[PDB]
């Protein structure tokens, strides 16, 4: 619904300052874990 009566003219100002803005953000993260174990046992028994 039209709330106001159509005016004969409009009050305006001119502004043509165009702007372009681009932002890029990259993030990386890497985490490597390594573990290792070894156990050894040797036994020897003798007699004649």
């Amino acid at each position: 619904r039209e709330l106001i009566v159509r005016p004969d003219t409009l009050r305006a100002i001119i502004n043509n300052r165009a702007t372009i803005e681009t932002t890029t953000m990259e993030a990386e993260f890497t985490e490597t874990l390594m573990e290792s174990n070894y156990n050894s046992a040797s036994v020897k028994v003798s007699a004649p």
Partner: protein, 48 residues
Amino acid sequence: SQNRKLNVKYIVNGGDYTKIQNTEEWVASTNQSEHWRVIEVTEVTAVA
């Protein structure tokens, strides 16, 4: 860990603002009267 941030901004005030991303064409259009704008103000007077 790695981070990268890139930010680009273009601003135009006068000339053909549709050539904001094309520097050569904006420079070519700077001689057209219909696009001349106020680029700085060197004197300001209080309205009173």
